[PDB]
Amino acid sequence: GITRSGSELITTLKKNTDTEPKYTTAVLNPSEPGTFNQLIKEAAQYEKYRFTSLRFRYSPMSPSTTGGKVALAFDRDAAKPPPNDLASLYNIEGCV
Amino acid sequence: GITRSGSELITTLKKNTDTEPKYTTAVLNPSEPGTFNQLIKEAAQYEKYRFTSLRFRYSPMSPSTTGGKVALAFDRDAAKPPPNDLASLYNIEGCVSSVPWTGFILTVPTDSTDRFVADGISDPKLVDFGKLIMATYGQGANDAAQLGEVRVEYTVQLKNRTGSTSDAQIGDFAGVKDGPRLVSWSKTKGTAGWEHDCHFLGTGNFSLTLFYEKAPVSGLENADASDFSVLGEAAAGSVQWAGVKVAERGQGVKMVTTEEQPKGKWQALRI
Amino acid sequence: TRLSAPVALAYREVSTQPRVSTARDGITRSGSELITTLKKNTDTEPKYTTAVLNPSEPGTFNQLIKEAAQYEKYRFTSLRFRYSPMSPSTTGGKVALAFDRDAAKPPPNDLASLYNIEGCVSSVPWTGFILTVPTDSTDRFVADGISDPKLVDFGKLIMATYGQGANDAAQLGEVRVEYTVQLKNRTGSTSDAQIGDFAGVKDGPRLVSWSKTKGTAGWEHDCHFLGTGNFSLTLFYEKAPVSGLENADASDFSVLGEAAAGSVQWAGVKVAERGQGVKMVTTEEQPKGKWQALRI
Amino acid sequence: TRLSAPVALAYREVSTQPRVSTARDGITRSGSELITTLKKNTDTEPKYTTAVLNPSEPGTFNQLIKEAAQYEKYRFTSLRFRYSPMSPSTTGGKVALAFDRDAAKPPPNDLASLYNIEGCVSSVPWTGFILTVPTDSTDRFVADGISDPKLVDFGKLIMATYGQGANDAAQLGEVRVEYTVQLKNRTGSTSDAQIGDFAGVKDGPRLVSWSKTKGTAGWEHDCHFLGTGNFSLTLFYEKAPVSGLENADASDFSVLGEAAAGSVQWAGVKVAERGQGVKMVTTEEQPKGKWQALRI
């Protein structure tokens, strides 16, 4: 048994001129290179996990004169394709 | 902060058929590849530690008809060289010895001070918690090849946190080296020319990649490694990729250039 | 009735903690040390290995030597030797421990005489036994130079092995002292580095024992080391010798120096078994010079 | 009211008995030692004499060094220095004792700074005073080689004298330690003979401190001896030096050897006051060789 806490960096979002959302997903498993860059090394030594706590912080980097929007949502199914319209995106529980 | 108890295999002691006892040491630091094979990965991401509980175990592997003895002592000064005579070893505090065919334990009292995870260039008296001394002596020619295995059952408290240290030890021929201390090079002039040979401080399957700016005298060659297989091509401006299996510390490979400090680059990994 | 025989016996040895204390006249130190490991002897007659019982004796004591350098007299209030087997139960021969109260008399020459010594115990190599020697109430001077061993030394332990087969364990066991000494008086701390010339002068702990032997090339002086460990030996020749320092039967001998008039050598000898040493050759019996043994 | 002034004060000093005892982790040794005797200084500015507080320091401790050679860590549970006057009441000037918790910082340069040190006591040369230094609960490694003094040394005592007249007592007093150390851990007895090359390597008790200084003839290496007593110094030159060993400011210096490639010298230096030493000259900065200091 072991309990660890961390704060990784998933990715940096990019501008999208088109008014339709452009999605970029990130599967949430400890042994996922796309999501975790440091937890993978210690997850390779274990074969089970349980996320006691979990949060996703968006830290702005753009000037104050940039429009558009940025949305973070959590889909409890890791195989479902990302939604195809804004309404479906906002229907996801907890989307902010 | 993170507490990580566990148990790991340091090495397996081997027959000492000669008369002088043989001493093998393993510095007790979480970043030492000689003693740790799994806690090193976790300690790469932390820059402080404290051994809440430490203890060593000897598991027999030899027949019941094996002579000689094996000893296990802990020295709190990681800088001191290994003892020179058996009496001094047996004078160390808490030194436990027994016949090879029976197992024993050695509990190490631990203090409540924090030390920086080793970087390889700092004073051992400042970073390391101590070292372990394993002695084997008094074995005849009819004894088994292997006597037993030494293991460490610990409980460490890694503190703070930082950027993960590189898993591969990149370096440069006769120059700078970065990453975990997996290998160490040495040079000795010879008939053909300057001979550069590396020694693997850890035990396991490695992967050594090399790059020659100028054509060397000879390519990678087994020196005393258990297994070996090169898949490159020695030549000017080429790279040689090799896989070396190490059973005991100090085994490695070699090369020849005839030019001291040749221009190139090497990479070591524990696959 | 029935009495079984194991394949082997395992003794667990843990380094205990010395018990030091202060008395009216001095201190009373108790502890345990390791003398040596007995080796196989595939011959009927015994082969001996001696260890003089006296604090400040590097061969016998390793830690009590330092604590006895600050004191002048001693009295072994209780000492006792123990044997730990490390050989299977299929090893023949025997192991004998005896305590000779005269520290100069050479070990006996035949097995019959070895058993006449009072208190001589013995047993099979694969079992442990203890030899406890009665002590007395006489104070003796800690060894400091060339003096009669009858006057300073308390005694001498004798360890013998014999009767082992050809295909037997290389080493049979190891002896271990268990003393309780009474150090008395006090003095300025004394250095530990035997120093003396070739005319029979010695000043310090007994680390070396020279021995002349006439030869065709010249008188050969053999520097036998009583202990086992790493030593250094500086020599100063007043007259040019036949040869410098050479490795006689020791292990890992290295010398930095030259042989000539007024020259000085410096040999880092290393000893794996008590008795090994180096040698030198000169044309002059009892040559003029100096030497200095140290435990480095 | 009235307060008389004697012609002189007599302190009776009797060598007490060290109190050794055994604890769970090690031993607890109490005792008293003599550091040095202060000398007259007929100048307004101070003249300093330092003594590093650490067991296995030959300059400071004479008997605790031997008892600390068997142990690895220490903790001064209680230490305190005392001053015994041996000068009449007609001597001017002053005597100052201070304890610098940093063992590498050089002694101050002016009297004003000397009095800013915490705990700095002082008095007239003809009366006795005690400086008691608060201790802590941190274990430190007994000195074993070249290491940062911040990490191993507990501190450094500083003794200063100044303001004495021309026709005053030659020596004013003498300092005396009174410690209670807690030695812990344990290890095979370590030899007492500093050994190291000229590249900055040292292994053993701090008996010597080399110091380069560029000169017209070549780089001069001065072998300053931190203690006071009889020493021996073996040197090995790999390359022929400009000159061998010469007496710089010590007393009774004698050397048996020659200066040349591969040659070895052997100097029995004698020191009457801490800091005296010998010297040698070479044309190569950081020369290749070895040296070995010993207390013989």
Label each residue of D10-41 as H, E or C: CCCCCCCCCECCECCCEEEEEEEEEEEEEECC
Contact B132, B25 (CB under 8 A): yes
**A2 to chain B nearest CA, in Å?**
6
Contact C283, C234 (CB under 8 A): no
* Contact (CB<8Å) C265/D265: no
Distance CA B264, CA B220 (A): 14
Pick from C22, C264, C296: which is nearest to D266 by CB? Answer: C264
Number of H helices, E strands in chain C: 3, 19
Residues in CB range of D106: below 8 A, 6 or more apart: none
CA dihedral D129, D176, C26, C30 (to 10 degrees): 110
Is the minimum CB–CB distance between C189 and chain D shorter than 8 Å? yes
Burial of D215 (0-12, 13-18, 19+ CB in 10 A): exposed
Distance CA D37, CA D35 (A): 7
Token digits for C111? 């097995």
* Contact (CB<8Å) C87/B67: yes
Count residue pairs from B and D with Cβ separation < 8 A.
39
Picking from D197, D280, D199, the residue whose alpha carbon sits closest to that of residue D240 is: D280
Picking from C18, C23, C77, the residue whose alpha carbon sits closest to that of residue C53 is: C77
Contact C230, D225 (CB under 8 A): no
- Going through C134-250 in order, the beta strands assigned E by DSSP cover 140-141, 155-162, 171-184, 195-196, 208-211, 219-225, 232-237, 243-247
Tell me the CA distances in angstroms from B222 to B182, B188, B197, B227, B259, one per residue in order. Answer: 17, 17, 10, 8, 21
Which residues in C lie closer than 8 A to residue B69 (C-beta atoms)? 86, 174
Residues 70-109 of D with CB under 8 A from B: 72-73
Residue indicated by tokens 């806490």: A5
Best C25, C183, C192 member to test D by mutation, with max D CBs in 10 Å, is: C192
Residues in CB range of A17: below 8 A, 6 or more apart: none
Distance CA D103, CA D76 (A): 15
- Using only the alpha carbons of chain A, give its radius of gyration: 16
Residues in CB range of A24: below 8 A, 6 or more apart: A11, A13
**How many other CB atoms are found less than 10 A from the CB of residue D43?**
12
Residues 28-57 of B with CB under 8 A from A: 38, 41-42, 44-45
3-class secondary structure, D292: strand
* Cα atoms in the 13 Å half-sphere on the side-chain side of C195: 10
List for chain B the helix, strand, coil content (%; round to 5): 5, 45, 50
* Cα atoms in the 13 Å half-sphere on the side-chain side of D22: 13
Resolution value, angstrom units: 3.1
Q: Give exposure, D235-258, as e/b (b: 16+ Cβ within 10 Å).
A: bbbbeebeebbebbebeebebbbb
Distance CA C193, CA D136 (A): 37
Which residues in A lie closer than 8 A to residue B3 (C-beta atoms)? 2
Distance CA C231, CA C224 (A): 11
Is the minimum CB–CB distance between C226 and chain D shorter than 8 Å? no
Distance CA B104, CA B92 (A): 17
Contact D273, D228 (CB under 8 A): yes
Residues in CB range of B213: below 8 A, 6 or more apart: B236, B237, B262, B263, B264
Which residues in D lie closer than 8 A to residue B93 (C-beta atoms)? 185-187
* Torsion over CA: C12, C17, C21, C27 (sign): positive
Contact D205, D65 (CB under 8 A): yes
Residues 105-134 of B with CB under 8 A from C: none
- The DSSP symbol for B49 reads B
The rounded Cα D260 to chain-centroid distance in angstroms is 33
DSSP result, C164-189:
--TTS-SEEEEEEEEEEEEEES--SP
D236 sits in the region (left: phi over 0; alpha: psi -120 to 50; else beta) called: beta
Best D54, D184, D187 member to test B by mutation, with max B CBs in 10 Å, is: D187
Strand C94-100 with C121-123, pairing: antiparallel
Is the minimum CB–CB distance between C266 and chain D shorter than 8 Å? yes
- The DSSP symbol for D46 reads -
3-class secondary structure, D100: strand
Token digits for C23? 């008395």
**B152 to chain A nearest CA, in Å?**
17
Tell me the CA distances in angstroms from C222 to A85, C204, D96, D215, D248, one per residue in order. Answer: 99, 19, 57, 46, 38
Best D192, D194, D255 member to test C by mutation, with max C CBs in 10 Å, is: D192
Pick from D139, D148, D187: which is nearest to B123 by CB? Answer: D148
Tell me whether chains C and D touch (3+ CB pairs under 8 A): yes
Residues in CB range of D192: below 8 A, 6 or more apart: C191, C192, D65, D66, D69, D204, D205, D294, D295
* Contact (CB<8Å) B125/D151: yes
Residues in CB range of D113: below 8 A, 6 or more apart: none
Residue indicated by tokens 């030096």: D241
Picking from B270, B121, B266, the residue whose alpha carbon sits closest to that of residue B198 is: B266
Tell me the CA distances in angstroms from D202 to C11, D66, D206, one per residue in order. Answer: 41, 19, 8
The rounded Cα D248 to chain-centroid distance in angstroms is 19
Strand C155-162 with C94-100, pairing: antiparallel
Burial of D112 (0-12, 13-18, 19+ CB in 10 A): exposed
Residues in CB range of C99: below 8 A, 6 or more apart: C53, C81, C117, C119, C131, C133, C155, C156, C157, C158
Best B15, B17, B18, B19 member to test C by mutation, with max C CBs in 10 Å, is: B19
Tell me the CA distances in angstroms from B116 to B37, B43, B120, one per residue in order. Answer: 19, 10, 11
Is the minimum CB–CB distance between C187 and chain B shorter than 8 Å? no
Tell me the CA distances in angstroms from D250 to D211, D228, D277, one per residue in order. Answer: 16, 10, 5
**How many other CB atoms are found less than 10 A from the CB of residue D232?**
21
Contact C104, C50 (CB under 8 A): no
Token digits for D166? 């021309």
Distance CA B118, CA B128 (A): 7
Q: Determine the residue of chain D that is closest to C265 in CA distance.
A: D264
Pick from C65, C265, C294: which is nearest to D189 by CB? Answer: C65
Q: How many residues does chain C have?
A: 296
* Contact (CB<8Å) C229/B88: yes
Count residue pairs from A and B with Cβ separation < 8 A.
22
Picking from C88, C82, C129, the residue whose alpha carbon sits closest to that of residue C6 is: C88
Distance CA C87, CA B91 (A): 23
Contact D282, D236 (CB under 8 A): no
The values of phi and psi at residue C23, to 5°, are: -120, -175
* Contact (CB<8Å) B88/C227: no
Contact C68, C190 (CB under 8 A): no
- Residues facing B6 on adjacent strands: B154
Contact C143, C54 (CB under 8 A): yes
Distance CA B143, CA B15 (A): 7
Residues in CB range of D52: below 8 A, 6 or more apart: D59, D60, D103, D149, D153, D155, D156, D206
Is the minimum CB–CB distance between D22 and chain B shorter than 8 Å? no
Residue indicated by tokens 């860059």: A37
> What H or E segment, with its residue span, contains residue D152?
helix D149-152
Picking from D38, D41, D40, the residue whose alpha carbon sits closest to that of residue D51 is: D38
Is the minimum CB–CB distance between C64 and chain B shorter than 8 Å? no
The rounded Cα D95 to chain-centroid distance in angstroms is 18
Contact B74, B109 (CB under 8 A): no
Pick from C14, C62, C86: which is nearest to B91 by CB? Answer: C62
Residues 137-156 of C with CB under 8 A from B: none
Contact D135, D78 (CB under 8 A): yes
Which residues in A lie closer than 8 A to residue B161 (C-beta atoms)? 6
Distance CA C168, CA C93 (A): 10
Residue indicated by tokens 């976790």: B42
- Residues facing B253 on adjacent strands: B222
Give the CA diameter of chain A: 49
Nearest-5° Cα angle at B50, B46 to B54:
125
Picking from B241, B192, B185, the residue whose alpha carbon sits closest to that of residue B217 is: B192
Which residues in B lie closer than 8 A to residue C228 (C-beta atoms)? 85-87
Q: Determine the residue of chain C that is closest to D289 in CA distance.
A: C256
Roughly how many angstroms between the first and final C-alpha of chain C, as a whole number?
Answer: 56
Distance CA B261, CA D202 (A): 29
Burial of C185 (0-12, 13-18, 19+ CB in 10 A): middle
Distance CA D242, CA B105 (A): 58
**Side chain identity at residue D120, one-letter code:** C
> What H or E segment, with its residue span, contains residue D151?
helix D149-152
The rounded Cα B201 to chain-centroid distance in angstroms is 4
Neighbours of chain D (3+ CB pairs under 8 A): B, C
Q: Determine the residue of chain D that is closest to B82 in CA distance.
A: D188
Burial of D12 (0-12, 13-18, 19+ CB in 10 A): exposed
Distance CA C53, CA C99 (A): 9
